[PDB]
Every structure is written in structure tokens, then in C-alpha cells.
């Protein structure tokens, strides 16, 4: 009926609560990591830019903040998702960054 929650291979994303429940266990992160996932999950299903995300934490700019965004997602992913969930990180050459499972 309504659409306020997206399920994955083995997790539960909340577009209204902005959270992720893995096998019934909510993942914990920091402010920066929370921002990266906040937008990623919020815009789950579609590729979004990086300049915007960086603005939600550090700031916006025509250049790249030492690729802190990409590194923030990869560093946080290998922090727990390294074994928790599979490689759900996917990027489209000529778009930005998006989250999704390959099983789909």
C-alpha cells in the first residue's frame, strides 16, 4: 500500500527513519558515515552526485575534497560491511555513486 521501507538481500533500509537493519541488527556509524548513507539510502535505486553529499558534511565545491566521500564509503564499508553484507557498493561511470545488491 505505502512506500516507506526498502528491503535488500539481507537488510532493511528506512527512507523515513534513515536506518539500516541487517538481519535484525541496526548498523552503527559516525556523523560523516551517517551522511554518506543518509543520502545513499534516501536516494537508493538511483545514482547521485558527490558534490552534494560532501556538502551535507564538509561543504560543496567544483573540485573534489581529497575524495573523502568515496574513501568514506569504502573505509566505512570495510569497517563492518567487510563481512556483514556483500559488495553492495556500485558506481556508474558518468554519474556518481549508488547502493544496491548484485543478486538483484
XYZ file of C-alpha atoms in Angstrom:
104
model
C 0.000 0.000 0.000
C 2.518 2.592 1.184
C 6.212 3.017 0.385
C 8.406 3.884 3.367
C 10.845 0.971 3.528
C 13.140 -0.812 1.076
C 14.418 -4.346 1.661
C 17.658 -5.787 0.290
C 19.479 -9.113 0.003
C 19.824 -9.177 3.790
C 18.932 -5.788 5.270
C 16.140 -3.265 5.826
C 16.518 0.330 4.643
C 14.275 3.073 6.024
C 13.564 6.124 3.866
C 11.534 7.662 6.691
C 13.741 6.693 9.631
C 17.003 6.749 7.673
C 18.285 3.499 9.178
C 19.561 0.076 8.125
C 18.660 -3.181 9.868
C 20.895 -6.121 8.959
C 19.398 -9.485 9.915
C 17.535 -7.632 12.649
C 20.608 -5.681 13.729
C 20.864 -1.934 13.125
C 24.311 -0.834 11.953
C 26.133 1.950 13.796
C 28.268 4.691 12.245
C 29.665 8.187 12.789
C 28.455 11.585 11.622
C 30.350 11.511 8.334
C 29.464 7.884 7.603
C 25.867 8.667 8.561
C 25.729 11.425 5.946
C 27.068 9.218 3.153
C 24.496 6.517 3.896
C 21.806 9.091 4.673
C 21.762 10.295 1.066
C 22.663 6.928 -0.459
C 19.748 5.211 1.279
C 17.458 8.209 0.794
C 18.123 8.129 -2.950
C 18.520 4.347 -3.072
C 17.831 2.976 -6.538
C 19.339 5.925 -8.391
C 22.857 7.312 -8.808
C 23.551 10.641 -7.106
C 26.400 13.188 -7.315
C 29.233 13.525 -4.799
C 29.451 17.315 -4.563
C 26.028 17.273 -2.903
C 26.908 14.635 -0.308
C 30.174 16.377 0.569
C 28.079 19.486 1.205
C 25.934 17.599 3.716
C 29.103 17.115 5.763
C 32.103 19.250 4.813
C 30.989 21.574 2.016
C 30.325 21.950 -1.711
C 32.849 22.838 -4.415
C 33.656 22.422 -8.109
C 36.626 20.250 -7.146
C 36.843 17.096 -5.030
C 37.579 17.121 -1.299
C 40.527 14.723 -1.456
C 37.943 12.127 -2.482
C 36.879 11.994 1.168
C 33.398 10.906 0.095
C 34.414 7.816 -1.874
C 37.022 6.936 0.752
C 34.447 7.460 3.500
C 32.135 4.872 1.940
C 34.922 2.377 1.261
C 36.512 2.868 4.682
C 33.184 2.509 6.491
C 32.156 -0.448 4.332
C 35.304 -2.397 5.204
C 34.783 -1.355 8.825
C 31.877 -3.763 9.300
C 30.222 -4.496 5.956
C 33.503 -6.174 5.015
C 31.997 -9.393 6.372
C 28.479 -8.334 7.359
C 26.955 -7.756 3.921
C 28.283 -8.373 0.385
C 29.611 -5.749 -2.029
C 26.522 -3.537 -2.232
C 28.603 -0.564 -3.369
C 28.212 0.215 -7.072
C 29.252 3.216 -9.165
C 28.202 4.194 -12.687
C 30.906 5.638 -14.936
C 29.477 9.086 -15.608
C 27.018 9.516 -12.747
C 28.295 9.414 -9.179
C 27.595 6.776 -6.541
C 24.758 4.370 -5.746
C 23.984 1.479 -3.400
C 22.459 -1.843 -4.456
C 22.910 -5.618 -4.471
C 24.231 -7.699 -7.369
C 21.867 -10.577 -6.594
C 19.029 -8.433 -7.941
